[PDB]
């Protein structure tokens, strides 16, 4: 339901060193299938830190 | 009174002068700095009326308490600005000139 990227202000953007535009990155993040094991859990924030 | 009729007819020079609130003697519009109408020009407030509601040119009478009163200093009647839509001027020709509609 939401995406934050460091040093990225809005959806139409390009991160240096990255091939995909933020729109395409989000388009990929729409296809992420996330399973919750705990029935009481309404929300989760996943963190991704990568480089090189 | 109700308007039941509309009449159209030629205008005598006297009729034209009776419509006129003043003669335009100068081919000038507005001052190049003050941006206010020039005296005896096409935009003169003396003739056609004031720019601002119930206020004269120099600002002596600024309120509705004076209505119909013509300023002595600037010669501008203190009244509604809307009269600038309604007030005819005139130009007195040195020689007669044919109205093209009735010639051509």
């Amino acid at each position: 339901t939401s995406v934050y990227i460091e040093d990225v202000l809005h959806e139409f953007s390009t991160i240096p060193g990255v091939k995909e535009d933020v729109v395409e990155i989000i388009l990929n993040l729409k296809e992420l299938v996330v399973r919750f094991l705990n029935p009481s859990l309404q929300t989760v924030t996943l963190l991704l830190k990568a480089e090189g | 009174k109700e308007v039941r009729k509309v009449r159209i007819a030629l205008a005598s020079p006297e009729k034209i002068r009776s419509w006129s609130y003043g003669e335009v003697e100068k081919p000038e519009t507005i001052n190049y700095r003050t941006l206010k109408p020039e005296r005896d020009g096409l935009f003169d407030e003396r003739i056609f009326g004031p720019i601002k509601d119930y206020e004269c040119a120099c600002g002596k009478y600024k309120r509705q308490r004076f209505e119909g009163k013509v300023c002595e200093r600037c010669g501008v009647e203190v009244t509604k600005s809307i009269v600038r839509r309604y007030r005819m001027g005139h130009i007195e020709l040195a020689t007669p000139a044919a109205h093209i509609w009735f010639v051509k």
Binding site: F12, T14, K19 | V3, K5, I82, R85, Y86
Partner: protein, 1112 residues
């Protein structure tokens, strides 16, 4: 995915460079690449050679010219609103005849607009295209006199504004009359001025019986050329004193002066070809050794008499022949305006030469460049042929540059254009596209250049053909003008060939456009391809041969309205012309040489070529075009990729892997759906929104100025009187909205304050001020806000300030702020969709996925089209596209089906069979037999005669699948649609017309100055125009009060509208209307005309509608 291509036609030559009609023209005009001494006399060179030398210092002469480098690059020019241009210097030398003094100098003539790489211009930061103009070619023509059968009018036509049309006629009284500037005079007179004598005319024109007798006038031959010259001058110039040198000057200027009268090079050539003579100059005659000498006139009169007589070999001219109509490209138009401005500069030069110090003068003192700059600027700015460029997608621009207008300066004015000029001529074949033209008032006037077509040096359009010698087709390609094409028998490109030899004893050909059946021995030439008959847009329509002309026109046109989509794909069925369209559009980024990819980024792609040099390609990202469609290039390669010359690096907008992508490939069903598709409307699935199909990025520009005023300066500031932090939240320290902030209607893009006008507070304001004990501020809120129904995310802000480096605004302007607001538009109800076949419509419903008609395997269709659109429109191409699309859906492949050499029904049946095996056999393997519903549908189809009775259910489902029909289940009921329904992949585009940019409403708002009637347009928050015909509607309904409202309260009655609004907000009934202000304006404007208009009561007593304000 694998791409299968059909057709047996092998194109010998590729499509020529598509924008070459622009590029090569302007190049040829500028000659900036040529060293000054090697320059030809064509182009602005011609202008300098025509204007100079300037005589009567005594003489100023032209040496050479040069073009410098652009002071600013293209992108910077778009940023700062500057014209992309190069400085033009001209080397001149002043020479005094007596003195011998020679003063040489290089003078600055101003700047000239440079054409960009793609064939466009940048004028004040706005991209513009100069549209080519078709007109009647210069030359000598002979046309039938409409009044007198058996008699003919000879016409001598020069270039536009190059001097007078001259008409030669044989009068009812027998004499030959010449018409110049609407003056009829005997031609014999001019002939005598030319130096002709009765002897010469008797021997030359005598062969034609009794015509020459009308040319014989004794009084004319009784006087020397001088007396006839003075007589002619008195005839052409009444009231002007008949001085000799004045007569010589006027007549020379009228005919022999190359600086005034000029035929075309085309005109010269055409007149030479027609009259069978040779012209020394481009004029009608010359001044040589003191006298006038004939060039044109005599052979012209000779041909006129020969035609009038019936002498064989003389014929009338078709003025619509494309040999008689030529194209003026951008170079020629610019050159013309250049010639004009240069001549004005010359008049200024002479006027300067009479004045001033006679001894001390330099070319810098004599030359004022202002008129030249003015002519160029005016041509590139306010001209008709200069059009705001259409960049909506790449194809838009490409087609725009290829337009041909019969309109414009020196062109046909509208409504004066009859069926003749708007028609498709037989000579348009291979030259101008018979398909693509605007519908409505512009039909036939605006056209498009054909694909293979070329415009030669003379301005005529040529089409390629192949040489056929003795039933063998060579690869030799000859480009022909229409007149040359008329000479030969030209076979069609689909003509059967075994190797290079014609394989049929009957071939279909053309002789002067006429279709004829001939033997291979009679075949001189052959078509290159069917592609050459149609435009670039029309060439993008698959199965075009199955579509009626008009819908084809619509599709062809609408393809330029296609909006670039973020997920956009190329069509499942293409014509093969896609890649070329992308490449010539310069939208996509291509590899310059063979090499390896060093770096890949969203911003930039770095490539190391064979040379070893490192080339960095910066990528254009989220750039706003003229129409507000997003322009961005996405990298199509990865780091370390090995690329060859011309390989794709980055994909432009509306491009998928270098193929033109104007839309999405969707799965459609053709069937009525609950009246939601009624009358061309379309029903789409929410799934399209879910996967972001038909979603487009749009950037809008907002601008505001802070200027110096007499009441004190306007300034951009975060301090806005009487506003909360809620309102100022997204504003930065300086008052400009921060990057990334979402904006909505009413929000402040740029805060600005303006010193209030002179304020005399009304007693109410005074008392209120006293009550609240607060001082009324000096400034008021002028801030730029988001207009109704707009907004989005703020992606950019530009701020320019007076007193800052590299920055100078227009006088009085302190600072300029531009905000860019971008939005991502999902497909919504009211948005316009269309295919390439002309089917178009707005989305009237978006269904949840569960309601959509679905396949047995559970796959719902994307789009439901109404079959009721097909039969009356007669475009069947969409049907075939749907079939082949089905096959390509289940086989997971794409096709190329060229126009007129296509995929054919049997082949499509083969592919459909192969597909059916996948669509069915998979199911049968999974452990599922035939459904009951399928049996029911199969029963219905048996009764329909669609399937053969007695075959197994599977075989019948195949029989239906080969017809491109499938069993379809209703999403709501679960029951099947009683009949089998056509389902398949179709290419559908989302057009530029979106309900978001359209929907508008107004209660009250701004009014016009004089009439006090509401403004027009959405931009001004204006009211809808209620026209004369609407008033007729209300009258015919007999609704008096509604009409009276429209006429008074709702528009120009000031008292009435104020009273109305106040009555409504108070919950009262609207008052009785009064006299509308526009009527008062009429009365006063009539009084200005010295006509007294009086409104009277029934007693004929005057009534004042001005209420005593106008009476003393």
């Amino acid at each position: 995915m694998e791409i299968k291509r059909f057709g047996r036609i092998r194109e010998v030559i590729p499509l020529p460079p598509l924008t070459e009609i622009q590029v090569e023209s302007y190049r040829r005009a500028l000659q900036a690449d040529v060293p000054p001494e090697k320059r030809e006399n064509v182009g602005i060179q011609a202008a300098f050679r025509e204007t100079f030398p300037i005589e009567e210092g005594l003489v100023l002469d032209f040496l050479e010219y040069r073009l410098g480098e652009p002071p600013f690059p293209q992108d910077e020019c778009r940023e700062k609103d500057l014209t992309y241009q190069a400085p033009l210097y001209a080397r001149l030398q002043l020479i005094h005849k007596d003195t011998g003094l020679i003063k040489e100098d290089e003078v600055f003539l101003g700047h000239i607009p440079l054409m960009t790489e793609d064939g466009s211009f940048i004028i004040n930061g706005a991209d513009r295209v100069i549209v080519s103009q078709i007109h009647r070619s210069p030359g000598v023509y002979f046309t039938p006199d409409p009044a007198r059968p058996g008699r003919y009018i000879a016409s001598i036509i020069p270039l536009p504004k190059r001097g007078p049309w001259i008409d030669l006629e044989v009068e009812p009284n027998g004499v030959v009359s010449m018409k110049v500037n609407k003056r009829k005079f005997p031609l014999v007179l001019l002939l005598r001025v030319l130096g002709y004598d009765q002897e010469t005319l008797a021997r030359e024109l005598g062969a034609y019986g009794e015509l020459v007798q009308g040319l014989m006038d004794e009084s004319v031959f009784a006087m020397r050329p001088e007396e006839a010259l003075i007589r002619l001058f008195t005839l052409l110039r009444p009231g002007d004193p008949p001085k000799r040198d004045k007569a010589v000057a006027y007549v020379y200027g009228l005919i022999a002066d190359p600086r005034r009268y000029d035929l075309g090079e085309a005109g010269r050539y055409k007149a030479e070809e027609k009259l069978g003579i040779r012209l020394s100059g481009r004029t009608l005659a010359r001044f040589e050794d003191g006298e006038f000498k004939d060039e044109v006139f005599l052979p012209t009169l000779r041909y006129l008499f020969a035609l009038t007589a019936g002498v064989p070999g003389h014929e009338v001219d078709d003025i619509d022949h494309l040999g008689n109509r030529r194209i003026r490209t951008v170079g020629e138009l610019m050159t013309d305006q250049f010639r004009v401005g240069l001549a004005r500069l010359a008049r200024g030069v002479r006027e300067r030469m009479l004045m001033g110090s006679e001894d001390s003068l330099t070319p810098a003192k004599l030359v004022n460049s202002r008129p030249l700059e003015a002519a160029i600027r005016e041509f590139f700015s306010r001209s008709q042929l200069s059009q705001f460029k259409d960049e909506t997608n790449p194809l838009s621009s490409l087609r725009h540059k290829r337009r041909i207008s019969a309109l414009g300066p020196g062109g046909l004015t509208r409504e004066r254009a009859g069926f003749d000029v708007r028609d498709v001529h037989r000579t348009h074949y291979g030259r101008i596209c018979p398909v693509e033209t605007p519908e409505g008032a512009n039909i036939g006037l605006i056209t498009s250049l054909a694909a293979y077509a070329r415009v030669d040096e003379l301005g005529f359009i040529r089409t390629p053909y192949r040489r056929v010698v003795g039933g063998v087709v060579t690869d030799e390609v000859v480009y022909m003008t229409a007149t040359e094409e008329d000479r030969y028998t030209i076979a069609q490109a689909n003509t059967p060939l075994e190797g290079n030899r014609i394989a049929a004893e009957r071939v279909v050909a053309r002789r002067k456009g006429e279709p004829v059946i001939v033997s291979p021995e009679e075949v001189e030439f052959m078509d290159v391809s069917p592609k050459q008959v149609f435009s670039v847009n029309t060439n993008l329509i698959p199965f075009l041969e199955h579509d009626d002309a008009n819908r084809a026109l619509m599709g062809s046109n609408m393809q330029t309205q296609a909006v670039p989509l973020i997920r956009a794909q190329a069509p499942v069925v293409m014509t093969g012309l896609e890649e070329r369209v992308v490449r010539d559009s310069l939208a996509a980024l291509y590899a310059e040489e063979d090499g390896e990819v060093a770096k890949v980024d969203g911003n930039r792609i770095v490539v190391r070529y064979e040379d070893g040099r490192l080339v960095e390609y910066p990528l254009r990202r989220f750039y706003r075009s003229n129409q507000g469609t997003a322009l961005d290039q996405r990298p199509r390669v990865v780091v370390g990729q090995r690329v060859r010359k011309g390989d794709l690096l980055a994909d432009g907008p509306a491009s998928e892997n270098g193929f033109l992508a104007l839309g999405q490939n969707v799965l459609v069903a053709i069937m009525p759906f609950d009246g939601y598709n009624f009358e061309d409307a379309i029903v789409i699935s929410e799934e399209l929104l879910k996967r972001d199909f038909y979603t487009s990025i749009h950037i809008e520009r907002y601008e505001i100025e802070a200027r110096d005023t007499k009441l004190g300066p306007e300034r951009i500031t975060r301090d806005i009187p009487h506003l909360s932090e809620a309102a100022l939240r997204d504003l930065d320290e300086e008052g400009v909205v921060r990057i990334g902030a979402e904006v909505k209607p009413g929000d402040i893009l740029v805060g600005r304050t303006s010193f209030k006008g002179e304020s005399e507070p009304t007693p109410e304001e005074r008392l209120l001020r006293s009550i609240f004990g607060e001082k009324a501020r000096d400034v008021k809120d002028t801030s730029l806000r988001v207009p109704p129904g707009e907004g989005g995310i703020v992606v950019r802000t530009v701020r320019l300030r007076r007193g800052d480096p590299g920055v100078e605004l227009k006088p009085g302007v302190r600072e300029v702020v531009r905000v860019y607001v971008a939005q991502k538009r999902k497909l919504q109800v009211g948005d316009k969709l269309a295919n390439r076949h002309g089917n178009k419509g707005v989305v009237a419903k978006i269904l949840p996925v569960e309601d959509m008609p679905h396949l047995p395997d559970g796959t719902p269709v994307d789009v439901i089209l109404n079959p009721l659109g097909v039969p009356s429109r007669m475009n069947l191409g969409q049907i075939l596209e749907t079939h082949l699309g089905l096959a390509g859906y289940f086989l997971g492949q794409r096709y190329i089906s060229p126009i007129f050499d296509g995929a054919k029904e049997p082949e499509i049946k083969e592919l459909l069979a192969q597909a059916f095996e996948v669509y069915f056999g998979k199911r049968k393997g999974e452990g599922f037999g035939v459904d009951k519903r399928e049996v029911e549908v199969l029963r219905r189809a048996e009764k329909l005669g669609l399937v053969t009775p007695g075959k197994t259910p599977e075989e019948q489902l195949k029989e239906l699948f080969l017809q491109g029909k499938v069993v379809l289940y209703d999403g709501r009921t679960g029951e099947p649609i009683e009949g089998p329904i056509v389902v398949g992949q179709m290419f559908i585009m989302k057009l530029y017309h979106m309900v978001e940019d359209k929907m508008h409403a107004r209660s009250t708002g701004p009014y016009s100055l004089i009439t006090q009637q509401p403004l027009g347009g959405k931009a001004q928050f204006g009211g809808q125009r209620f026209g004369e015909m609407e008033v007729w509607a209300l009258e015919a309904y007999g609704a008096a009060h509604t009409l009276q409202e429209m006429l008074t309260l709702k528009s120009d009655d000031i008292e009435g509208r104020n009273a109305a609004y106040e009555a409504i907000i108070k919950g009262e009934d609207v008052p009785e209307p009064s006299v509308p202000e526009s009527f008062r304006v009429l009365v006063k404007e009539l009084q200005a005309l010295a006509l007294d208009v009086q409104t009277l009561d029934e007693k004929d007593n005057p009534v004042d509608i001005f209420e005593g304000l106008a009476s003393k």
